[PDB]
């Protein structure tokens, strides 16, 4: 049984590889562009060099011919489509590449599968990763469900609305075993440095090592996020893929997935500062270049639909996930891998 | 005062240029790719050649640099963005170009305007044309209004969903005077041959001239729609454009726009056969190559929101619109411009 | 269950592809597939509509050069034995200000076609003959008084020129790398009654026809007249494409071989205007004016040819006189205006 | 203070051009990158960048025209080092569309933005368009390449630099934009990407030394000739050309071949890397199918007379030290647990 991971070098993809190698007998294929950063997969290199259950396929979301070669030659039984331009902030000023990679990237994958299904009966389970950002700037005091209206908060958000409709459409039109996951915040030690809890943790680490004045730079703190560790999120994807295989997930079925621990962003900063010998002496300053034209600033979740379909809960406390992320930046700086403060 | 029409060579765009020339003192710019069909605009060639109030700008939806030159050099005061891959049936097998031209083409326009507004205060009214097709296979019995949830019935439908959220987003994010129109079926003598009422009118005219056996080939008829002549639709667009300029349409506001008259598809056929001397002798046959993986179905009746912002109603009878279209195909065959039966 | 040699024409709705379809139906036993985007102008193919409705030897496949998935479907489902790849943004002048779509459609479009073929060859042994249509504009602004041959240095005179250099190298590369039976044709000017209105000899004939019919002042608007072109009727060019296609099938044309192809008759642009004016009763009374908007940042202003390579591989010369090609084009525009299909004067 | 833009700032050459400009000029430096690109080559710059000391970052993608528009409009660099590309021929074969898009259209996206700004406002930057000796593809044996050598399409990458090269010349000739085009040989050293021949040989030796690989180096075609120089010599050539162009001594769109003095058959490069290793005499070399190419640009020997006639320049760094620096880089990475793929 063969699993393809798109976005293998990313936060979630690299951890899905780890999870599948430790918890299944699956062969794993990691899709990447050849020059993608190795930071998340260095621990997998020897195993890949040894051809022990995991291999790399070189393909770009934006090269349909590369994806054709991948599906024709590898025929993955299950696909975790995690590859995307994942960052809303750059999507404002680089919106064309965000729309191309996320919407057209996903159409390039799904159309490749559709044609191979018509020709040869290829019938893979296809995980299409959407985002809770399809709900953009959601009304306060209400929890999100799978029928909550979509709001375009950013080109990234619109790109994920596109990804989402494509996932549902290809399932509904061609009976491909797609399911769509509208994820809240999933984080932990491999969270990209640009995301809120990771830039806060990283700036604390920079401050502790004397690289930055003891002022954390932030954007809008009037925002509510639900967190869980990727190690929990990934189990939900694996458990959904099994149900999809067994016939229990309708083609194109959508699911909101999040943790149970929700925070106003000042509470996350306070948790991270409490892990620092010098937290009592570190201030916070809102700066203009971290603000957004529209902020999707409220993500609270009713998880009743997902828990009705799989037997799953988040096990890792959010304080441990955050501590892991702070130690990660501490370790990078100690080793001379000085990050941007961004 | 200068008006840009994207999709100038198309059904609606060509008729919008006629409306503005007859009813306003506006200078008119028609955007086109140089090789576009001239069928809808032969009657404007003379006055274009003579530089009388209308001019052509050569640009492509997929060439940002061509749109950059358009907005910088011409600075239209109002923009009717009608250019699209308009046909759902081809969108199934040519999905990438539908998504690229419709979503990214719209993003190319809106990001060009955005940057010009930030640099020089350029503040045009921007009609972003979406479609009732965003509602796709609508939930039987829910009242259909501007807050009904979208459904992705085709790559076309998803591309107009994309277009819709781009229009909304660029309005909300950057205070660009966008408004989004979700129009029901508009038709009349310039309806492209491929659309339902056009292919039926066209096949009847082929049968009346002995080019086809007296069998009309159709797809699914278990569909109900509102119809309006384009010349009514254009009035609604024009009147909205005035309200947007006056400050009365919030940036990014969306509007469903339905005709007065609703029909089952067999009833549209019955109206067309009754304009034929040989109507009593023509069979209708459903064939597979006209069937769609998903067939959209919505009763979009409720115009209470558009009627609240403009003094407007469809005035032209649908029977006259369908007769005009049948006569168009009769005239085309009579001139030896024999169309495909498609 | 009767199986025929199948020809695909990309650019079926264009000047050359429309005439290639006519040629194959009259002179061969081939089934013809016309590739088009559905909304493409019908002007050049109205006379085929009845035949196509009747499923008599010619069909339409809807695909876009920029939609790889659409081409995959076309090659997988139809497996044409021979491909005339004529589809392009064909016009240098618009390429200056719409350069990205010119580069995407011509270079990436051609790459989408060839990569689809490469993959079907490796999997299933699909081995079509592939005509990759390039342009003498690969030589851009060539040194004056010298004949072009196939080893003449390339020059980038426009985004269109660079797109056809890209198209040309892709044609040679897929041939040399994967043993796809490509050949590349670097054509001079081929014209006649379906020449698009924007090209020199077409705009000049169109303007004369507008003047005769009372739609224009007796001034023809032109750009740079210090330019040399070699002309042949498309009806002669398509014969060369056909005969080269048979030689590729036969193993006589190495994968990715390039050929310059052009007519016998070369002219300075004013001579072309005088030939067309001499076909008009209004001809002695019409002035010629250079206007800024028909000028170009760089003009590929010299195209004369050593045709020795193509004539050594096929038994072929242009037979239609250019005066007859030009007369047919003027009569086309007269007919168009008579029928109320009033063109732009562009 | 003069403003320099580097595209491909995170790459082998861009990152070293930033080092070179900071050390040798009073130029403000702008590094273009997509936000997620590898930090490997620029970690040593993060603190400078954080403290806004002469170097900054602008987020743009070659394939997003609007992002490049914001860059030239807002930042108006006086000099541009266009080094960003899909740089690798091997992946270009099976990922050809992205190579063509990023390299040809990416360059068009840059040059068209500059054209429109020059027309409107008189923006007149110097524009280094980096091409490749691979425009000459599979060249004739026994003959040096020069600027008039016939072009040959050896790979989608090769064709993508042919496109890039013609765009460089065209935008210069058509619009009098101060472009120059550089068709480089092999420039290498410690930041050389792991997939390239001398970097994969040197990396595989390091994996063998540290016990991560059997003592067999996997290679492709060894019947190939290359001319090497250290990137620290190449970047000096680009800089000197940028001064000449600013003075008005480089015709708009002028092309230059640039390469070092030291040429080698590939086996000779392997033998120099093995002699740096205590395990040298013990390691086999095995040609493998998955490193072979449909066409190989087999032969890169250079006539450098044109470049030496326009700037006062030659390669100074011996290629032996260049390869030593590369081998020691892969030793350090492995010793620090940054275990590379063996590809
Ligand atoms: N982690 C979260 O909190 C969160 C929230 C909601 C949704 N998601 C979604 O989950 C998925 C994975 O998130 P992540 O945190 O791992 O993101 P990430 O940024 O860490 O990883 C993105 C991956 O996509 C790859 N990629 C980008 N462009 C590509 C292209 N053109 N071709 C091929 N690969 C390309 C990158 O190289 C990388 O491996 C994404 O779709 C993201 O939008 C994440
Ligand atoms: N008429 C209806 O029933 C209806 C219903 C809902 C929405 N709409 C929307 O109304 C608009 C106009 O409809 P129509 O009937 O006139 O369609 P049409 O097909 O007649 O017009 C399409 C136009 O877009 C242009 N276009 C296509 N691709 C282009 C590109 N790459 N660059 C530039 N121009 C390009 C075409 O040349 C043509 O002018 C479309 O956006 C359509 O989706 C129409
Ligand atoms: N006729 C000449 O004098 C001449 C000279 C040298 C080169 N050529 C080349 O010969 C070929 C044919 O010339 P022509 O006069 O017939 O050109 P044309 O402009 O009449 O036709 C071009 C064709 O390409 C199609 N096309 C354009 N973009 C497309 C896309 N995105 N997807 C699908 N189809 C698309 C058009 O619809 C049309 O059918 C072209 O490649 C042209 O560059 C012609
Ligand atoms: N080093 C050599 O031996 C050599 C030889 C001849 C030519 N060249 C050319 O010199 C230049 C620099 O080479 P290098 O060794 O530094 O290459 P590299 O692979 O080390 O660097 C490539 C750079 O381009 C960037 N890039 C890739 N795609 C991008 C995109 N879509 N948007 C923005 N940036 C993108 C990468 O992120 C990276 O910064 C390239 O143009 C290369 O083709 C190199
Ligand atoms: N990335 C980022 N987000 C911030 C910052 N300060 C506040 N935020 C907010 O943190 C929330 C989450 O942002 P982010 O981590 O980028 O992930 P998102 O959920 O994908 O937008 C948003 O409401 C941001 O506006 C900051 O400095 N960086
Ligand atoms: N185009 C087309 N549509 C048909 C045909 N027969 C039935 N229909 C249906 O008529 C409805 C209108 O389709 P169409 O005219 O293509 O417009 P759209 O789908 O609203 O853009 C859809 O439900 C079609 O599936 C036909 O022969 N052609
Ligand atoms: N299209 C066009 N070309 C013109 C005109 N006047 C002169 N030319 C020149 O005629 C030559 C041929 O141009 P054109 O017909 O576009 O074909 P091409 O440039 O060879 O593809 C070029 O040298 C043009 O500069 C004109 O009015 N229209
Ligand atoms: N990258 C790479 N190239 C190899 C290998 N074995 C031989 N070569 C040859 O080494 C030469 C240089 O290739 P490369 O370093 O990829 O740089 P290029 O000059 O950009 O193709 C080419 O002739 C390759 O065919 C190998 O294992 N990896």
Short mmCIF file of C-alpha atoms in Angstrom, two decimals, chain A residues 28 70 76 81 108 129 135 162 164 166 173 177 181 225 249 280 283 296 333:
data_model
loop_
_atom_site.label_atom_id
_atom_site.label_comp_id
_atom_site.label_asym_id
_atom_site.label_seq_id
_atom_site.Cartn_x
_atom_site.Cartn_y
_atom_site.Cartn_z
CA UNK A 28 5.82 6.47 1.35
CA UNK A 70 4.13 10.81 -10.85
CA UNK A 76 -0.34 5.97 -5.07
CA UNK A 81 -2.27 16.75 -0.82
CA UNK A 108 -3.48 19.70 -12.02
CA UNK A 129 -6.10 19.87 2.52
CA UNK A 135 -14.57 31.02 6.55
CA UNK A 162 -10.84 27.27 -4.75
CA UNK A 164 -12.05 23.25 -1.38
CA UNK A 166 -12.19 21.52 -6.53
CA UNK A 173 -18.54 14.71 -10.60
CA UNK A 177 -12.56 9.30 -3.22
CA UNK A 181 -10.12 19.05 5.57
CA UNK A 225 -7.10 30.72 17.24
CA UNK A 249 -16.69 8.95 3.44
CA UNK A 280 9.13 39.35 32.92
CA UNK A 283 7.52 43.76 25.98
CA UNK A 296 -9.44 36.36 9.58
CA UNK A 333 20.24 30.01 17.16
#
